Write a protein that binds this ligand. Structure first.
Ligand SMILES: Nc1nc2cc(F)ccc2o1
Length: 153
């Protein structure tokens, strides 16, 4: 669709020139809908000094369906599973999700970055991590740091 293509050209331009701090996103090859992204570990989070790569797939009905985003870099987090799937409202269609066409790739990567700093034990994908985050925060932080040094550094 020409609508989809013109929208992706503008998004790639904005990702190339005014990416959110800590976030970068680019074409894997020459397809505007097969993208990769990277989020730096935030300071004063246990992911600090880690670099996290993500796969960003833009579905055929974008911008009416959300980007399909998974971590490629392993990450220890209540809302991210061992395959890198992300439990985050803006990645899902309504009524339950929050995706709308006025969000975009940069918005949702920023939301994923914010989720990394502020987990949601409301909506766990990882029950054991969520309980550890909630009830034994120092163990959570040590495990999350150790997973970062092991897989993201
Ligand atoms: N895989 C998965 N993603 C989710 C996003 C939500 F907002 C709620 C439940 C979810 O489950």
């Amino acid at each position: 669709s020409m609508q989809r293509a013109s929208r992706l050209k503008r998004e790639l331009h904005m990702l190339a020139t005014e990416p959110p701090p800590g976030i970068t996103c680019w074409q894997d090859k020459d397809q505007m809908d097969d993208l990769r992204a990277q989020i730096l570990g935030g300071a004063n989070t246990p992911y600090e000094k880690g670099v996290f790569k993500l796969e960003v797939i833009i579905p055929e009905r974008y911008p009416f369906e959300p980007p399909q985003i998974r971590f490629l870099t392993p990450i220890y987090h209540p809302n991210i599973d061992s395959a890198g799937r992300i439990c985050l409202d803006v990645l899902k269609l309504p009524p339950k999700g929050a995706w709308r066409p006025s969000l975009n790739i940069a918005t949702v990567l920023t939301s994923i970055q914010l989720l990394m700093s502020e987990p949601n034990p409301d909506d766990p994908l990882m029950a054991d991590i969520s309980s550890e985050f909630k009830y034994n925060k120092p163990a959570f932080l040590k495990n999350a740091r150790q997973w970062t040094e092991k897989h993201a550094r």
